[PDB]
């Protein structure tokens, strides 16, 4: 359980996805930034 | 011919179970654990010459070893080989 | 070699049995000895459903250290240290203090 | 969805197996580092 | 490889320098040509990959002495 918890905390450490906050969290930040311009 | 020094090392134990038992008491076949590298000619010759009976035909399967564990330490057992030795009409053992 | 050995009579120097004599039952390669009637522990063991079931509190002897015993002189009647001399190509033990071969 | 690891034993061995690490200079250096690090299984064979 | 079989001339390395002195790596190559040398003592043509001053030293030392050197150092011709 401890090994699975360390690896499953280590899941989104090297991500790329920009529309999702922290790799996973859905948001509207594309529209927020885009409307700020 | 097969040398007798080879031919003694092949048979290893008689196999006791209920499939073995019904094979003896129903179809003349004695089931026995053999050497892992033992061919059917060696098992046939070794039952011909070590229990002095007449063997009709041998059928050999190989049984895979079970991964057991002690405590939190695993281990596979060990593969062995099982020979279904079908005797002729005149036999005892 | 070994100073205290198997069929030998010793006296106990330290603890719970200080001054008690007794014969060495056996001698364990931990550097311990079991000496009869000396280090009595009160084990109590379960009556296993296999071969015979004693149950109860069995009073065994425990292993004491080899350094806690010394072999009994009986010519002086006290504890005595052991040396090793050669006699006729035999490495014999001997009592110190009167120099007697055992 | 079709994930990336679609296993095949024959491609596992032809690709990353022992006879294929030993087949060249740099795979032998791979085996040398795995032995030197001291590793229970060197290649992926079985 | 580009080695003269007589003089043993490998390609060496160096720099293209420029007017601004920018160092770049280059290779100097030997003038290797594959020439076919008549040997009178054996009555044959032995073809070698010589430099263009392996031919100078064959013209001076003679082809027999040179082949004795190649046979001496295990260079197979």
């Amino acid at each position: 359980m401890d090994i699975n918890w360390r690896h499953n905390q280590s899941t989104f450490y090297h991500f790329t996805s920009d529309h999702r906050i922290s790799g996973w969290k859905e948001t509207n930040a594309m529209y927020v930034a885009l409307n700020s311009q | 011919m097969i040398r007798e020094e080879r031919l003694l090392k092949v048979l290893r134990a008689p196999h006791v179970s209920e499939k073995a038992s019904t094979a003896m008491e129903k179809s003349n076949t004695i089931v026995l654990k053999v050497a892992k590298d033992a061919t059917k000619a060696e098992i046939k010759a070794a039952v011909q010459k070590l229990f002095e009976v007449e063997v009709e035909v041998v059928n050999t399967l190989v049984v895979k070893g079970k991964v057991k564990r002690h405590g939190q330490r695993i281990g596979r057992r060990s593969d062995w080989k099982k020979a279904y030795v079908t005797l002729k009409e005149g036999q005892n053992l | 070699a070994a100073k205290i050995r198997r069929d030998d009579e010793v006296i106990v120097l330290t603890g719970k049995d200080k001054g008690k004599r007794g014969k060495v039952k056996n001698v364990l390669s931990s550097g311990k000895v079991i000496v009869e009637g000396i280090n009595l522990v009160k084990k109590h063991q379960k009556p296993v459903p296999a071969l015979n079931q004693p149950g109860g509190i069995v009073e065994k002897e425990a292993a004491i250290q080899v350094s806690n015993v010394a072999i009994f002189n009986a010519a002086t009647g006290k504890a005595d240290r052991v040396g090793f001399r050669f006699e006729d190509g035999k490495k014999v033990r001997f009592f110190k203090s009167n120099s007697e071969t055992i | 969805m079709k994930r990336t690891f679609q296993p095949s034993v024959l491609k596992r061995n032809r690709s990353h197996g022992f006879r294929a690490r030993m087949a060249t200079k740099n795979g032998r250096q791979v085996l040398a580092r795995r032995r030197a690090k001291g590793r229970a299984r060197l290649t992926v064979s079985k | 490889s580009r080695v003269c079989q007589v003089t043993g001339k490998r390609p060496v390395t160096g720099n293209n320098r420029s007017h601004a002195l920018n160092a770049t790596k280059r290779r100097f190559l030997p003038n290797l040509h594959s020439h076919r040398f008549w040997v009178e003592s054996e009555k044959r043509f032995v073809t070698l990959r010589v430099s263009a001053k392996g031919m100078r030293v064959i013209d001076k030392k003679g082809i027999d002495t040179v082949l004795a050197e190649l046979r001496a150092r295990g260079e197979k011709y």
């Binding site: - | 007798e4 020094e5 003694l8 048979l11 134990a13 006791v16 | - | - | -």
Partner: protein, 63 residues
């Protein structure tokens, strides 16, 4: 038994070789694995005794 095996001929260590394997070894594997054979030390001493016969047999034959 180490000098005793050392003082026979090659043919006689082949005889007691085949009798260590034949009579002793096989009958004790069959007897051991069929619930019989209280005395298990026999397996060990037979096995080491075959090691002695093969040792002296290799030492006697040639080098």
């Amino acid at each position: 038994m180490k000098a005793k095996e050392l003082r026979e001929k090659s043919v006689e260590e082949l005889n007691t070789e085949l009798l260590n394997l034949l009579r002793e070894q096989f009958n004790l594997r069959m007897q051991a694995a069929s619930g019989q054979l209280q005395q298990s030390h026999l397996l060990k001493q037979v096995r080491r005794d075959v090691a002695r016969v093969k040792t002296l047999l290799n030492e006697k034959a040639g080098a």
